[PDB]
């Protein structure tokens, strides 16, 4: 308590002191919704010196789930129903309300489809066991942190030979996003690596970025002091002209990552080029079930026709710029006007990890 406040004040003073002698403006990016929550909750952007910026990358797996996949899942529900098949669709609570030009999962539910909100894929497994006569499918988004438990449940279902347990895989990888943002402009000279994701892929998983682009990195937890320390460290590393990755979250992250989880994920999933809503196609950034485990993917059972020309976002939504770290929600003309948690225009406002929802949640009036 008193200690945390003491450290925070001292860290901000060091940041100010180091920043004074910066050539120009330094941009530090994070790609983790919880880091954004911490940053905004504690007003860290205002505390920083004018020449130090914290950029919010695409750290929301729900926000970037493609419209085509949500719509496709919806079309599979309809095609299965016309065949007399009662499918039970599970989804996280925020994904449940993600908008698309053809409606959300919640809209589908109001039509009488069996759509259920779950806390995790373990609930899907339980529901599958509760309804052996019904197909149970989890629309499954998520970065490495969420993919790990999905792989774990699949391994359990595989051992049991559960045949009514499926997923619609829309899992994504974080490092590739960081690479694309860099090549596509988005300027930043340091990275705060996500803590949870790092727990799975370890320091090892981010190294290629430092080796390929020379960008310094600090793996950090979510306390405001973890974020402040990371910022202080990246500034020093930058000024000192060094390209290294420092693990400030060793209590939860091993250099090698969680090898057990990594192996479990690779056992069922294969990395493919994948779409990221409002951002385009990122090569080798998505995960799909391997050919050997195709029976677990619902698309292996139903083929549907997603209509063409479906726009990624509703008119005026700047979620594209926001996910790129090129604009803050306050830069969006719909923010708090036509777009709010009650009536969201874009995915950035619905998602729990969404920068726009985070800005709203903390009453950012800016």
- By CB under 6 A, name the one of 348, 352, 358, 363 that touches ligand SF4: 348
**To the nearest whole angstrom, how small is the minimum distance from the Cβ of residue 326 to ligand SF4?**
11
SS3 call for 166: strand
- By CB under 6 A, name the one of 28, 146, 335, 353 that touches ligand SF4: 335
User: What whole-number distance in Å separates Cα of residue 319 and Cα of residue 349?
Assistant: 9
User: What whole-number distance in Å separates Cα of residue 319 and Cα of residue 81?
Assistant: 34
Exposed/middle/buried for 186, CB within 10 Å: 0-12, 13-18, 19+?
A: middle
Question: What are the phi and psi torsion angles at 307 (to 5°)?
Answer: -60, 150
Site string for ligand SF4, 269-308 (x = CB under 6 A): ----------------------------------------
Q: Does 219 participate in binding ligand SF4 (rule CB under 6 A)?
A: no
Consult the annotation and say whether 332 binds a ligand.
yes
Instruction: Give how far the C-alpha of residue 67 lies from the chain's centroid of Cα atoms, to the nearest Å.
Output: 15
**To the nearest whole angstrom, how small is the minimum distance from the Cβ of residue 319 to ligand SF4?**
4
In the chain, how long is the greatest CA-to-CA distance? 70
Kindly determine how many residues on this chain lie close enough to bind ligand SF4 according to the rule CB under 6 A: 14
Q: Please identify, among the stretches 198-206, 266-274, 292-300, 345-353, the one whose residues bind ligand SF4 according to the rule CB under 6 A.
A: 345-353
Residue 26 tokens read as 């330094």
CA dihedral angle for residue 275, residue 279, residue 281, residue 283, rounded to 10 degrees: -110
Q: Does 339 participate in binding ligand SF4 (rule CB under 6 A)?
A: yes
- By CB under 6 A, name the one of 317, 324, 328, 353 that touches ligand SF4: 317
Q: Does 232 participate in binding ligand SF4 (rule CB under 6 A)?
A: no
Which of 275, 276, 272 minimizes the C-alpha distance to 284? Answer: 272
Exposed/middle/buried for 116, CB within 10 Å: 0-12, 13-18, 19+?
A: middle
- By CB under 6 A, name the one of 169, 334, 353, 358 that touches ligand SF4: 334
Q: Does 32 participate in binding ligand SF4 (rule CB under 6 A)?
A: no
Contact 168, 297 (CB under 8 A): yes
Consult the annotation and say whether 60 binds a ligand.
no
Q: Please identify, among the stretches 92-100, 145-153, 253-261, 311-319, the one whose residues bind ligand SF4 according to the rule CB under 6 A.
A: 311-319
Binding footprint of ligand SF4 on the chain (CB under 6 A):
317-319, 322, 329, 332, 334-335, 339, 345-346, 348-349, 356
- The annotation places the binding site for [4Fe-4S] cluster at 317, 332, 339, 356
């Amino acid at each position: 308590a008193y200690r945390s406040r003491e450290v925070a004040m001292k860290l901000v003073e060091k940041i100010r002191e180091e920043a004074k002698t910066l050539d120009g403006e330094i941009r530090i990016m994070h790609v983790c919704g919880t880091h954004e929550d911490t940053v905004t909750r504690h007003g860290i952007r205002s505390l920083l010196p004018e020449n130090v910026k914290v950029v919010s990358g695409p750290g929301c797996p729900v926000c970037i789930t493609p419209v085509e996949d949500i719509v496709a899942m919806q079309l599979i529900m309809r095609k299965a129903r016309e065949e007399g098949e009662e499918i039970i669709l599970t989804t996280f609570g925020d994904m449940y309300k993600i908008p698309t030009p053809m409606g959300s999962f919640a809209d589908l539910k109001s039509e009488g489809f069996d759509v259920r909100i779950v806390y995790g894929i373990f609930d899907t497994y339980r529901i599958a066991k509760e309804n052996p006569d019904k197909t149970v499918v989890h629309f499954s988004p998520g970065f490495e942190t969420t993919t790990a438990p999905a792989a774990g449940m699949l391994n359990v279902a595989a051992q049991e030979e559960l045949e009514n347990f499926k997923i619609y895989s829309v899992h994504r990888l974080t490092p590739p996003a960081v690479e694309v943002l860099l090549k596509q402009g988005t300027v930043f000279q340091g990275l705060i690596a996500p803590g949870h994701v790092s727990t799975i892929i370890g320091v090892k998983g981010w190294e290629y970025l430092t080796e390929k682009y020379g960008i310094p990195q600090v793996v950090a937890g979510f306390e405001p002091n973890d974020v402040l320390m990371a910022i202080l460290m990246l500034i020093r590393m930058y000024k000192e002209g060094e390209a290294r990755i420092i693990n400030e979250y060793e209590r939860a992250v091993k250099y090698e990552g969680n090898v057990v989880a990594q192996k479990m994920i690779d056992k069922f999933f294969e990395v493919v080029d994948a779409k990221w809503r409002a951002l385009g196609v990122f090569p080798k950034s998505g995960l799909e079930l391997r050919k050997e485990w195709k029976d677990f993917e619902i698309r292996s059972f139903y083929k549907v026709e997603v209509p063409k020309n479906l726009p990624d976002l509703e008119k005026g939504c700047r979620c594209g710029a926001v996910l790129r770290g090129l604009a803050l929600p306050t830069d969006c003309p719909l923010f708090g006007k036509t777009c709010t948690p009650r009536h969201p225009v874009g995915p950035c406002m619905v998602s729990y990890e969404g920068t726009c929802q985070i800005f709203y949640k903390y009453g950012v009036l800016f």
